[PDB]
Amino acid sequence: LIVPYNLPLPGGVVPRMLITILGTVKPNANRIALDFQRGNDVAFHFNPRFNENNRRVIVCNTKLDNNWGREERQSVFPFESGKPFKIQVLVEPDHFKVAVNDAHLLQYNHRVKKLNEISKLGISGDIDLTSASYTMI
């Protein structure tokens, strides 16, 4: 698949929806980004950074009216340059739950409450993208 990739989420997200992203991190990767969009707003931005001041960190945030909010940062970093990965985002009633390579990584409390209007997922960054899909569990 071509990156950046736009995956429509028809009718928005709903609890029990599972989004699975398969790809490979490029050897000299700097960033990965998943952007769950509500129009121009970003309900949930998931942003692994491979070199923020020579540390690897995951930054999560929400963008409202073109303004970023308070960042939530996770120092646990399961990605590795050059290696294949699986990201799974499970929508639960109160949070997005993210697992990488079948291991729980983090939860992100819903700041954007109109889940049915979060209708696009943008996938970008230094990856080869193999598959992006969703299903109901």
Ligand X SMILES: OC[C@H]1O[C@@H](O[C@H]2[C@H](O)[C@@H](O)[C@H](O)O[C@@H]2CO)[C@H](O)[C@@H](O)[C@H]1O
As a three-state string, the secondary structure of 73-102 is EECCCCCCCCCEEEEEEEECCCEEEEEECC
Q: Which residue's beta carbon is nearest to the bound ligand X?
A: 61
Residue 70's binding partner out of ligand X, Cl ion, none, with CB under 5 to 8 Å set by partner kind:
none
When CB distances are held under 5 to 8 angstroms depending on the partner's kind, the choice from Cl ion, ligand X, none that residue 112 binds is: Cl ion
Q: Return the residues of window 106-135 that contact Cl ion according to CB under 5 A.
A: 112-114
Report the DSSP beta bridge partners of residue 96: 91, 108
User: Which CB, 57 or 129, lies closer to ligand X?
Assistant: 57
15 binds, among Cl ion, ligand X, none (CB under 5 to 8 A by kind): none
Task: Give the residues lining the site for ligand X (CB under 6 A).
Answer: 45, 47, 59, 61, 68, 71
What is the rounded CA–CA span in Å between residue 79 and residue 18?
Answer: 20
Distance CA 90, CA 81 (A): 24
